[PDB]
Amino acid sequence: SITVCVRKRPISRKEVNRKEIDVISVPRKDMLIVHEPRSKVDLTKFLENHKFRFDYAFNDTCDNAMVYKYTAKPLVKTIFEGGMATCFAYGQTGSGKTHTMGGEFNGKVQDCKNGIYAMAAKDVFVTLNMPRYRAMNLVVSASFFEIYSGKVFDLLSDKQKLRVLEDGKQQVQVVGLTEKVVDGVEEVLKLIQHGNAARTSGQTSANSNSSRSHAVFQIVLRPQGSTKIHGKFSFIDLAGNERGVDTSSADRQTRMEGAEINKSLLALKECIRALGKQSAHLPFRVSKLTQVLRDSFIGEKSKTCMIAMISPGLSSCEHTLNTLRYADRVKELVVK
Amino acid sequence: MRECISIHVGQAGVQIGNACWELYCLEHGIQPDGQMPSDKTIGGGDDSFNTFFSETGAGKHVPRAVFVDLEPTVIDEVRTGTYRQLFHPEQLITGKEDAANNYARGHYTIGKEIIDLVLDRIRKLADQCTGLQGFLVFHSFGGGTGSGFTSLLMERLSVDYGKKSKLEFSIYPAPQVSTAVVEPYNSILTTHTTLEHSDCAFMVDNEAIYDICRRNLDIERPTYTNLNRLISQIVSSITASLRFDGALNVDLTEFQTNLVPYPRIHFPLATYAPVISAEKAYHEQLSVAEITNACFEPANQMVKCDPRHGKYMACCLLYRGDVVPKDVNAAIATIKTKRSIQFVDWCPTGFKVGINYQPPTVVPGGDLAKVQRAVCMLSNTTAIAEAWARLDHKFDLMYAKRAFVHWYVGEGMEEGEFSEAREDMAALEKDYEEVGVDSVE
Amino acid sequence: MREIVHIQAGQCGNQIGAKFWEVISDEHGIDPTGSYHGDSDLQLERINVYYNEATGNKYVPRAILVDLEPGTMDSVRSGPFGQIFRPDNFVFGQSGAGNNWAKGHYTEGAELVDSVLDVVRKESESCDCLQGFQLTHSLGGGTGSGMGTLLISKIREEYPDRIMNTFSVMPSPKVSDTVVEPYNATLSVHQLVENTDETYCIDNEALYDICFRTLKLTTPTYGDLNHLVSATMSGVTTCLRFPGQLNADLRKLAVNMVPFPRLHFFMPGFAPLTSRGSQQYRALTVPELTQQMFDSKNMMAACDPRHGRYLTVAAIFRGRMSMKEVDEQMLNVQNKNSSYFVEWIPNNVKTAVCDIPPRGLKMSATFIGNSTAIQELFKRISEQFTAMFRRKAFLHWYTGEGMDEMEFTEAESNMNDLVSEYQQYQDAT
Amino acid sequence: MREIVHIQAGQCGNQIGAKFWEVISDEHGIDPTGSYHGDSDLQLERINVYYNEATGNKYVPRAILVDLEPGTMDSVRSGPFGQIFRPDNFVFGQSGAGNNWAKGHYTEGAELVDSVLDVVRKESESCDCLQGFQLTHSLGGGTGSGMGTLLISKIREEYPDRIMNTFSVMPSPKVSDTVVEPYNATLSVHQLVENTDETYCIDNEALYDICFRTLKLTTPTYGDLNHLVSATMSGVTTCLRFPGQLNADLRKLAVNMVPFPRLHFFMPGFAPLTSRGSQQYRALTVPELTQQMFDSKNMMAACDPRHGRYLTVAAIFRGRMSMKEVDEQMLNVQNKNSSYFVEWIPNNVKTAVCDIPPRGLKMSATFIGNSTAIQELFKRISEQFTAMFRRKAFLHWYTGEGMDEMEFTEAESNMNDLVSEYQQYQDAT
Ligand SMILES: CC(=O)O[C@H]1C(=O)[C@@]2(C)[C@H]([C@H](OC(=O)c3ccccc3)[C@]3(O)C[C@H](OC(=O)[C@H](O)[C@@H](NC(=O)c4ccccc4)c4ccccc4)C(C)=C1C3(C)C)[C@]1(OC(C)=O)CO[C@@H]1C[C@@H]2O
Ligand SMILES: CC(=O)O[C@H]1C(=O)[C@@]2(C)[C@H]([C@H](OC(=O)c3ccccc3)[C@]3(O)C[C@H](OC(=O)[C@H](O)[C@@H](NC(=O)c4ccccc4)c4ccccc4)C(C)=C1C3(C)C)[C@]1(OC(C)=O)CO[C@@H]1C[C@@H]2O
Ligand SMILES: Nc1nc2c(ncn2[C@@H]2O[C@H](COP(=O)(O)OP(=O)(O)OP(=O)(O)O)[C@@H](O)[C@H]2O)c(=O)[nH]1
Ligand SMILES: Nc1ncnc2c1ncn2[C@@H]1O[C@H](COP(=O)(O)OP(=O)(O)NP(=O)(O)O)[C@@H](O)[C@H]1O
Ligand SMILES: Nc1nc2c(ncn2[C@@H]2O[C@H](COP(=O)(O)OP(=O)(O)O)[C@@H](O)[C@H]2O)c(=O)[nH]1
Numbered sequence A: 001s002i003t004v005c006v007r008k009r010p011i012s013r014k015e016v017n018r019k020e021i022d023v024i025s026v027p028r029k030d031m032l033i034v035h036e037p038r039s040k041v042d043l044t045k046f047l048e049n050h051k052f053r054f055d056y057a058f059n060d061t062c063d064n065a066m067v068y069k070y071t072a073k074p075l076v077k078t079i080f081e082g083g084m085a086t087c088f089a090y091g092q093t094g095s096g097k098t099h100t101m102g103g104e105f106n107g108k109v110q111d112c113k114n115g116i117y118a119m120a121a122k123d124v125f126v127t128l129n130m131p132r133y134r135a136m137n138l139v140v141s142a143s144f145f146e147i148y149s150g151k152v153f154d155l156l157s158d159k160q161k162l163r164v165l166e167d168g169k170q171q172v173q174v175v176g177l178t179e180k181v182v183d184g185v186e187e188v189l190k191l192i193q194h195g196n197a198a199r200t201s202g203q204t205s206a207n208s209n210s211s212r213s214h215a216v217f218q219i220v221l222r223p224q225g226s227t228k229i230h231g232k233f234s235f236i237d238l239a240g241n242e243r244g245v246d247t248s249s250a251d252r253q254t255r256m257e258g259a260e261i262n263k264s265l266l267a268l269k270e271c272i273r274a275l276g277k278q279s280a281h282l283p284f285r286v287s288k289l290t291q292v293l294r295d296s297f298i299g300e301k302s303k304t305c306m307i308a309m310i311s312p313g314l315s316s317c318e319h320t321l322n323t324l325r326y327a328d329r330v331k332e333l334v335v336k
Numbered sequence B: 001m002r003e004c005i006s007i008h009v010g011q012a013g014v015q016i017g018n019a020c021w022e023l024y025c026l027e028h029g030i031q032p033d034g035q036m037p038s039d040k041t042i043g044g045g046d047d048s049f050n051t052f053f054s055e056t057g058a059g060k061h062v063p064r065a066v067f068v069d070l071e072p073t074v075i076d077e078v079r080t081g082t083y084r085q086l087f088h089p090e091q092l093i094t095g096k097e098d099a100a101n102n103y104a105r106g107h108y109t110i111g112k113e114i115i116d117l118v119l120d121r122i123r124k125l126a127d128q129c130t131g132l133q134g135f136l137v138f139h140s141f142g143g144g145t146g147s148g149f150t151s152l153l154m155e156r157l158s159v160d161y162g163k164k165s166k167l168e169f170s171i172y173p174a175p176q177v178s179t180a181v182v183e184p185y186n187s188i189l190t191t192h193t194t195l196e197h198s199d200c201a202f203m204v205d206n207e208a209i210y211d212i213c214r215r216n217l218d219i220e221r222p223t224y225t226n227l228n229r230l231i232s233q234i235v236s237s238i239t240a241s242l243r244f245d246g247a248l249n250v251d252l253t254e255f256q257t258n259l260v261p262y263p264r265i266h267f268p269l270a271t272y273a274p275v276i277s278a279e280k281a282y283h284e285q286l287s288v289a290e291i292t293n294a295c296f297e298p299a300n301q302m303v304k305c306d307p308r309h310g311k312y313m314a315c316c317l318l319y320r321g322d323v324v325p326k327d328v329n330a331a332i333a334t335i336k337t338k339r340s341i342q343f344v345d346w347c348p349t350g351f352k353v354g355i356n357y358q359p360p361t362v363v364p365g366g367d368l369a370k371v372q373r374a375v376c377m378l379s380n381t382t383a384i385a386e387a388w389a390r391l392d393h394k395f396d397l398m399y400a401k402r403a404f405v406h407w408y409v410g411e412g413m414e415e416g417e418f419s420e421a422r423e424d425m426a427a428l429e430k431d432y433e434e435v436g437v438d439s440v441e
Numbered sequence C, D: 001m002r003e004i005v006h007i008q009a010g011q012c013g014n015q016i017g018a019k020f021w022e023v024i025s026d027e028h029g030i031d032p033t034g035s036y037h038g039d040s041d042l043q044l045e046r047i048n049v050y051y052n053e054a055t056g057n058k059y060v061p062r063a064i065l066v067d068l069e070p071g072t073m074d075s076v077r078s079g080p081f082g083q084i085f086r087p088d089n090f091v092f093g094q095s096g097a098g099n100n101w102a103k104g105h106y107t108e109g110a111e112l113v114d115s116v117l118d119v120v121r122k123e124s125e126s127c128d129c130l131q132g133f134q135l136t137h138s139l140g141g142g143t144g145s146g147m148g149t150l151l152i153s154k155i156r157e158e159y160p161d162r163i164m165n166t167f168s169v170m171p172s173p174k175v176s177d178t179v180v181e182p183y184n185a186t187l188s189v190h191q192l193v194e195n196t197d198e199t200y201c202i203d204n205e206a207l208y209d210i211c212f213r214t215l216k217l218t219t220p221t222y223g224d225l226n227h228l229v230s231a232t233m234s235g236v237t238t239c240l241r242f243p244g245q246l247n248a249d250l251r252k253l254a255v256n257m258v259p260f261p262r263l264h265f266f267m268p269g270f271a272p273l274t275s276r277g278s279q280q281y282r283a284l285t286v287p288e289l290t291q292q293m294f295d296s297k298n299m300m301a302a303c304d305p306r307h308g309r310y311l312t313v314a315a316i317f318r319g320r321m322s323m324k325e326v327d328e329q330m331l332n333v334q335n336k337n338s339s340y341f342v343e344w345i346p347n348n349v350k351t352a353v354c355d356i357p358p359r360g361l362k363m364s365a366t367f368i369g370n371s372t373a374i375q376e377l378f379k380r381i382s383e384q385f386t387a388m389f390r391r392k393a394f395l396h397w398y399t400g401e402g403m404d405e406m407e408f409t410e411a412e413s414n415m416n417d418l419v420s421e422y423q424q425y426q427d428a429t
């Protein structure tokens, strides 16, 4: 019961200067074709077509509101029934992941009016103001993580290093996170704008705000005067594997975080296929990113929505077939 | 009730108000002693005098206006003159010495001595209102009372009221013709309240109305009595749909929604198209088509300017009289066809049509004719920055040698305020360079 | 049984409805005071579709009049039919809307909508078995766009199974008399998507072109444009009031005009429309009426249906005519023009035939089309919107009234999404 | 059944057709307003050949009126029969044609032909089973030549199996009132070759000569020349409207008048034509009618058939006459004059005999000839054309309007080719 969507991103200006060839076509509503140039043994080049079918496929002209309406917008009428719901951002680095989740990259700033964080935090409140659901008298509170160097940090408080422990009921609890109480939608935009300004990110010329950590934004839905948890919507922005040509100026510091981004995703790649077959010991405790994402897969009231991000060009055709094959494996999953 | 308060400051502000309050007394049928005649057992508020005239009981119409001057001489023409019992006696406020072409006197020395008396009178008119629309401040850039006092008053009117619209009807200095030597110092200093406190500021100047009287109207030798009747037709058409019936009526807030793009881009120039003498009003084809073209003509502007050097951003067509709206759309589509008229590339829905039924009133002794149709065109354009560059250059000449500064410093302001108001007007002129240019990636 | 509440809002919606209550009140013989002076017994058997009977055989319309400005209310009272309405249904504020969507949907409209819905429920709770609603309003104003879609989105929370349709005026780039009308129309197409069962999209450029070319009028006024629109509005609910050979209610149309939900934007049309003088030259027959209903120059929406495919259409005939000629002429069109109809739906056309023509002519007709060519409307707005909003022009008049940009970009994207819903169902087999 | 659409174009074609709709409207008893005031029951049994019946027993002609100048339209409306036509078929621009072929076929005619063919298909789609068309136009003008052949070449793409014939006026060197008429006539004979089923070539010099010599008129006007032409146009489609002893439709003539295709240029002719006064001296019999139809001075084309051979002819008789005298007089001509008929075709003559003569005379007749002597027409034009074009005179009024010289030399050569098609079939056994 996992919905999978894919989003081809458009071609940048610099990739036109290097004369990049676009190979990803989205001809229909829910298909995609990868045009792979292949050569035979006698130097006769030919072309392969890799069809895919998803729940919904996005073009390169789609905006973040349309990506929102088909991914996280159906999952708001779930959090007000008692369940919990998440969404991933899984792909290559540079493939538009924090442009979808975080917001539109407006150069020096982050226009957080776009993004999936703000558009769902707005839509909780409109849903909370309906007379059917206003009767429950709930309290919306928001928290916001950061997973850097395998360890959990916090971004509401400045640099509170955090632990990952477990309840006796087999429930992972990060403790002690900061959980501010949100008044309105003008309050939750103040968290996200202050949150993204403190997220650890590199500084270069190609991707001046490349993600260096697996940011997790939670909106906790609590009844008033009970201190339980009635619903959670946990966003997940990943960091993305990077192992193509990342040899620019990488010192001992750059590949220190560099090999730990790739280590955290192999643990995530294994838990997908281990859930694919049956009865195996699900390696959730390998990386702490997989221990946070435990309730997304095996949750009895969990409805997730992975958004597979795709770089369009020819030089990223290798990572593209890698990334699309996992999302097809994510789609073919029946937990319970 | 769609009431409006007219505020008339300084000699030019009073003396325009003599031409405005002459005209509404004729549009509504009010004698100079405030009386409507006995042959009206009809709806007065259906003729809607009640935006400019509060009806005193036992048949008496007193205006919603306050005349303020720092000089006793100009308002004593209203006492007596002919309107000596039209106005309430307590809303004609005189000082004892004028500000005497000195912003520092009108704003600091002399102006604070009657500013409590002026503001207290406006509240007695604001309390008589039911549905107050906004303020109509008339003044002149380049007086002492028109600039110094009006800057003092618009600060205080923004604190007490704030949310109301506050329209200004200024007279801007002309490029060649000037009557004061210190005329540029008093115009840079009124820049701060004009952009910050007013919500839609209009500008006219005397040269651009002298030429309209000479060319469009064949008056060989105009006086100020000829000119202020042309200012008053712009005002009488703008505030017309508040107080007359018509298809496509426009409130004072439907201007600002449709005329002002950004909160600092609120300086629109007005025109008025059938300025035709009565002998030239025969041989006429004064249709909707010809009267729409005349507003876009660069010679018929009320400001010495040329909108072929900049781009329009919005227009606002307000028609009076025998006007059918399908004639207007056939006249708009000819205006959008022409390549002399450049709109901006973020406008595309060009401009707003308002239509009214009440045709204009011919003032007895007037210069205008009796027309079936008339058009005021309020229109933002980037070409009004060129009038500002011609006046910064006069300020920059005299303030380079710090000429008349010693009069201003010894009256209640500092030398440093010249360097702030020069930068402040240079920032607007940078805004019109950056709002006119279309964007690429 | 099967009552209709009429909620006319704004300036444009009140001017149409004031002309609308002068056509219905002629079809049933209602005096300008409200008494009955008809001669046919069918004029009273279903008069309760629109009219509550009051004391002394007076017939008061079930109409609710909304504005944010007292002026248009004063015009309708002082018009020909100010006597007809009840004075408790003239709901109006004092402070005008500003041609501003935010001011009529958030600030000064939400203050009034409590005092309007309390009057809507006085009409709806007195009916025997209410059928639905109708808004008459204007996409492009403050009250017709904003206040109209606040009224709509608060009735679906209370009457969630009644046919709500609108007769809404959409702007056109050829005829503009409002600078900020793309902002005001995009923010209300977004509301009409999720809340409405049928939407009869009308333009004004399409209504002068009917007056100029078809009717050969010399000086058209708004009284002529609203006269066409009011002839459509009576034509749709005809079989609800008069007996017929085939019947079609509001719900019966919506079942087989709307294939998928969210595709509920219709193109109206009326026939016959002749000039005066050139009516002695046209013979009135069913092949004559059919040619007008499918010519493009008799559409009340400024589109050409040759740039798309009709999903479904409906044709409501009024008069003592046959049923073979109706069933054959509606057949000889969708075979001659089979490239202009969607081919995965056989027999795209619905025929309704009443028995009572209007009171001055025999054999009228009404064309209602669900065409894929209505994406020409929504892209002409969504090009103007995205040319202003990318520079954030005229935006502080909206963000100053409670709104923010997140409501814009959502509303822009929902307009651009249903363009890609008529586009899929136009082409691709 | 067997309807005829009439497309009169230009000044000359409208003046003929306005006189044509005054002869037909007398044959069927149509009032100038449009009502019926006949006395014979045969006047209504086939009145739908030309007239659509409208509301209240009014009969509107199926005619479409084209011009590029509003003036001739104002004359026809203000004439005797302006009441008869429908006002939706007066199609006209404002900017005149210039007596220029290019301006009416490329620049300002192609702008209008969309608004004319859309009216042609309103007439053709309402007919039960349409037979064909008829143009009345003028080789030598801007609208009759250019706009007429644009209308023709856009109907054969849509109605490619209907009888389209023209009643076209060709220039003559004896009577010129236009300098550039060889340019305007050569460029439209080229269109009439590939697009027309019959072409009834008429001159004006041949029509004064009938008025001068035969009719003995003193002051002939254009109203007298068009009166002859309109008596031909009614005579050809007589058996289509009235019962006969032999019948001949438009298609039945074209089968056995046109041996090879591209040879479809006919010489019309009418009989009886007497002066007033000298009608008490002529006995009206079949040998009397036959002598007029084969005398050269009763041809409406300025040619002499003694300079060639008739391929085929047709004779349509109208009246209670015998069939032996028709079959014998049509035999005693093509044996007495056997050197003037082509001898590889036995019995060159087709007889049609109707039963209804015109309303003032008994026993009329109509001669239609396919003669090889019509190369005298096409060479008198193609000598004037090649004398102007070799100096490129008056050419920039054509190349400035989109044309080029390649359209000229093609059109000159196709005129000179069919001269060598009547020349082969004249001589050589
Ligand atoms: C002698 C004669 O037959 O006159 C006709 C007439 O000439 C024509 C041109 C009428 C005429 O309509 C118009 O000219 C017109 C004016 C403004 C807006 C729309 C139309 C007519 O005015 C309109 C009038 O319509 C009616 O009587 C219908 O019942 C109509 N009524 C109204 O619209 C109405 C008007 C004023 C007051 C009250 C009602 C109607 C249509 C649909 C639903 C309800 C009512 C008719 C047949 C005619 C005239 C009188 C010339 C036409 O219109 C209608 C609505 O029938 C225009 O094209 C049609 C064809 C008609 O033949
Ligand atoms: C006393 C008498 O018998 O008078 C005759 C007459 O004298 C003659 C001279 C008529 C007369 O015709 C002309 O003088 C004439 C004028 C202009 C153009 C062409 C001819 C006549 O005018 C014409 C008129 O023709 C008709 O009535 C036909 O029906 C004819 N009608 C019209 O052309 C017509 C004229 C005006 C209004 C409406 C119709 C017709 C022919 C073919 C197809 C349809 C109709 C006739 C027999 C005569 C007069 C009256 C003197 C002749 O013409 C016709 C067409 O019949 C000319 O040579 C014939 C021989 C006739 O005997
Ligand atoms: N159009 C018009 N302009 C006027 C009129 N009177 C004065 N002005 C302009 O006003 C400018 C000076 O302002 P004034 O009104 O004279 O002075 P003030 O505003 O009363 O302030 P003081 O200098 O203290 O009297 C002059 O340059 C004139 O151009 C008038 O009656 N009509
Ligand atoms: N759909 C899109 N349309 C336009 N620009 C886009 C889109 N998606 C991404 N971009 C641009 O692509 C650039 C890099 O996107 P980004 O979101 O940083 O990719 P990324 O995978 O998140 N890199 P990282 O942050 O390390 O994961 C930015 O300039 C974005 O504005
Ligand atoms: N068809 C028609 N359109 C109208 C009428 N009155 C106004 N309009 C149009 O409605 C648009 C604006 O809607 P408006 O009436 O101002 O609505 P409001 O301001 O919200 O009350 C304008 O473009 C007008 O062209 C009318 O009587 N008939």
Ligand SMILES: Nc1nc2c(ncn2[C@@H]2O[C@H](COP(=O)(O)OP(=O)(O)O)[C@@H](O)[C@H]2O)c(=O)[nH]1
Binding pocket: D009, D010, D011, D012, D013, D015, D016, D097, D099, D138, D140, D141, D142, D143, D144, D145, D169, D177, D178, D204, D222, D223, D225, D226
């Ligand atoms: N037989 C006849 N010929 C005419 C008439 N009017 C004009 N013509 C001839 O037509 C030729 C030119 O054609 P014209 O009428 O000018 O066509 P147009 O300019 O294209 O509309 C001239 O040589 C005239 O002699 C008419 O009423 N009858």
Ligand SMILES: [Mg+2]
Binding pocket: A096, A097, A098, A099, A210, A211, A238, A239
């Ligand atoms: Mg990122």
Ligand SMILES: [Mg+2]
Binding pocket: B010, B011, B071, B074, B098
């Ligand atoms: Mg003074």
